[PDB]
Design a protein around this nucleic acid. Structure first.
Lengths: 128, 37, 176, 126, 136
RNA sequence: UACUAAGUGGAAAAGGAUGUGAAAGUGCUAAAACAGCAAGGAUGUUGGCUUAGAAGCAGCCAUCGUUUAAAGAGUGCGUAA
RNA sequence: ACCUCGAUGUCGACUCAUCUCAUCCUCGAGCUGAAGCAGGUUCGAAGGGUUCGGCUGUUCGCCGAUUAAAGAGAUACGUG
């Protein structure tokens, strides 16, 4: 089996939801129930490779590099790291890392800040 | 088969051997075999 | 490297005896004979339930022998104590095989029926009509018989057909 | 390097002697994603986990006042669980992990300083 | 290709290139150079081929220097004619190469890149080439 | 006294090579390496642009920060994805 | 411009050929942009064979029909 990445909310048909070992009626109802208000964002999800697809449903935090407009105060210009239009503050970065801390595989705050900054470095933006 | 005065490895798994006083190469791909030089 | 790697011995029933040319091991399934060429500087001495060997002098050929005959001796010991098996996956729409006494015969896409002779001390078993297992006392004979039977319908990448070495993975190609 | 190995000997001897209780267990054929999940579980815990060579433990275990040693690092993937307080949570974590595995393989160590079997250490962590 | 524009003479004699090299026995500008271990005669077309290979394998990151230039012009009498009747006509320009002197040099690029560039340029020359580092 | 195994010796080039002997220091090693075998080989990331499919791998950006003893917008093979 | 002018008879055709392999076919093998037929390419190989006619004196060349093919060359550009 392969990874899944589906929109948060109602999705009766999926890329593979009829031959993975689960019922779509028994899946999409709870998928939408868990993400009823969280609709309209490309949310990362994970499907288990286990043979019975036991109920261990998990969700991740909203992706970085699409929300960098709030954190670094820019309008998504050239993607190179040699051109820049703005600077990232400390308060926005701390808030976004605090929100994304549940996505990490470790319980540490400054590490979360550095991870989010390094991911945002795709734009070439660094803390001033 | 391939005949060329110079033989060098071309992939990551192109090994070189000396068989019957002739240099040769062997690989997992049939488009890499070479025997001369 | 190999050659100074100590060789274990089986003193329950298996035993060894060396000559100027004969090195014979005797175990539960027959005997294995290794006939060395004359004038070999590699010297053999065996302790109780232990075997250690070495070349007396330093030459390239001597060092080659020092590993090669160690490998052949351990191969012979493992064979005489267990006996080796070769599993052949016979894949095809109509290809099959079975045994008529001393003859191992097959059904191919060939107009002429195909048969093969079994050397002495070799056994074959057809547990299912599309697979062969060939059991023997030394890897040399079983490998020779396997490559003798393989020489008809070598596998092709366009479709898995023929005789396979049981995890000899076939690399497929574009079937158009 | 060798001087780095000596300095690591001194460092790990200091780290082991700073505490009093520690258990080494074998969790073999494991994975790295579950390992960073472990690092998430132990972050609250004051203890930690490390992977370290056989000879260094052989020369450092007799300096940290621990006895009962014949194999300090052998037979599978090797780590260390040195708990300076609240090792309970770490032991519960490792117990759940070996539940996710097939069987328990005790190596050495004790909860508070006297090498003891796992027949009761498991119940301590259960 | 690389050719002088005028000369006080139109058809000079040939030159021997026996003995050790004269001038350009050590690198000047580039970091890694290609020395020749045999004296011979090389035209400007092979120099052009080596230069284009160097540039293509180099990229717009490093620099290269050419150490020689054709200053001589031999003759080649047209085909199927009898002997005599003065000298023939020039049709190429050649630079004499003495053994033990450098031909091309490169700098400002990683070691593997420059090594492969010089090796690629070397086979285009009719002389036995050899790599060389800056003397420092 | 050493050497080559080629009948080179007893015809020859550019090029190619775990053929072989000698010399110089070179990085490691019995606090155990090389070779092989047992595992793992990760997170932001199926990030974002575009390609009705490219999402560790049509192509491109950054090509970094963290978990760690160990891991790469992944060494590549291989998937519209 | 080395041997020949005190003579060494020069193309092609006819008959008869012989030799080399850098293979035209038959033969064995590898790779494949080899599904199978039919191919392409490279290696090994000289036992045998490698067509008949129109044009032109012709080799060559063009054309027509066959076959397995209608090979490359040499022998004072084989041999008055």
């Amino acid at each position: 089996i392969a990874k899944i990445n589906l929109l948060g909310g109602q999705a009766k048909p999926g890329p593979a939801l009829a031959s993975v070992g689960i019922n779509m009626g028994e899946f999409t109802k709870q998928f939408n129930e868990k993400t009823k208000d969280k609709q309209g964002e490309m949310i990362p999800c994970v499907i288990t490779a286990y043979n019975d697809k036991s109920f261990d449903f998990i969700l991740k935090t909203t992706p970085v590099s699409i929300l960098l407009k709030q954190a670094a105060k820019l309008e998504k210009g050239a993607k190179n790291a040699k051109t820049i239009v703005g600077k990232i503050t400390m308060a926005k970065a701390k808030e976004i890392a605090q929100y994304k801390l549940v996505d990490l595989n470790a319980n540490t705050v400054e590490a979360a800040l550095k991870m989010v900054l390094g991911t945002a470095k795709q734009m070439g933006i660094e803390v001033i | 088969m391939k005949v060329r005065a110079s033989v060098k490895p071309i992939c990551k798994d192109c090994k070189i051997i000396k068989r019957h006083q002739i240099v040769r190469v062997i690989c997992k791909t049939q488009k890499h075999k070479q025997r001369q030089g | 490297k190999i050659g100074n790697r100590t060789i274990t011995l089986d003193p329950a029933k298996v035993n060894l005896n060396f000559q100027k040319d004969h090195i014979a091991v005797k175990g539960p399934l027959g005997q294995i004979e290794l006939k060395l060429p004359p004038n070999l500087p590699l010297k053999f001495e065996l302790k109780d339930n232990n075997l250690q060997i070495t070349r007396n002098n330093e030459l390239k050929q001597s060092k080659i022998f020092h590993g090669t005959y160690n490998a052949l001796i351990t191969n012979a010991i493992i064979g005489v104590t267990q006996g080796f098996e070769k599993k052949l996956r016979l894949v095809g729409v109509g290809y099959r095989a079975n045994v008529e006494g001393e003859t191992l015969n097959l059904q191919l896409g060939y107009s002429h029926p195909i048969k093969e002779k079994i050397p002495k001390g070799l056994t074959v078993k057809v547990e299912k009509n599309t697979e062969i297992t060939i059991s023997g006392i030394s890897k040399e004979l079983v490998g020779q018989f396997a490559t003798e039977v393989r020489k008809w319908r070598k596998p092709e990448p366009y479709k898995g057909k023929g005789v396979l070495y049981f995890d000899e993975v076939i690399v497929r190609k574009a079937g158009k | 390097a060798k001087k780095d190995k000596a300095q690591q000997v001194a460092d790990v001897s200091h780290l082991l002697s700073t505490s009093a209780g520690f258990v080494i267990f074998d969790y073999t054929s494991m994975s790295a994603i579950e390992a960073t999940s472990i690092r998430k579980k132990l972050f609250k815990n004051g203890s930690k986990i490390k992977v370290i060579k056989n000879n260094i433990l052989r020369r450092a275990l007799k300096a940290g006042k621990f006895e009962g040693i014949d194999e300090t690092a052998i037979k599978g993937k090797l780590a260390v669980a040195v708990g300076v307080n609240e090792i309970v949570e770490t032991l519960k974590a490792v117990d759940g992990v070996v539940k996710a595995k097939e069987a328990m393989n005790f190596v050495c160590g004790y909860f508070d300083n006297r090498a003891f079997n796992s027949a009761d250490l498991e119940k301590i962590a259960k | 290709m690389l050719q002088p524009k005028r000369t006080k003479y139109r058809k000079p004699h040939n030159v021997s290139y026996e003995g050790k090299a004269k001038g350009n026995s050590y690198v000047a500008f580039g970091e890694y150079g290609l020395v020749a271990t045999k004296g011979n005669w090389i035209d400007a077309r092979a120099i052009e081929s080596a230069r284009i290979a160097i540039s293509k394998c180099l990229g717009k990151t490093g620099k290269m220097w050419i150490r020689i230039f054709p200053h001589m012009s031999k003759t080649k009498k047209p085909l199927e004619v009898r002997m005599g009747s003065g000298k023939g006509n020039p049709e190429f320009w050649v630079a004499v190469v003495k053994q033990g002197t450098v031909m091309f040099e490169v700098a400002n690029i990683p070691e593997s890149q420059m090594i492969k560039a010089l090796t690629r340029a070397g086979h285009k020359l009719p002389v036995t080439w050899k790599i060389l580092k800056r003397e420092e």
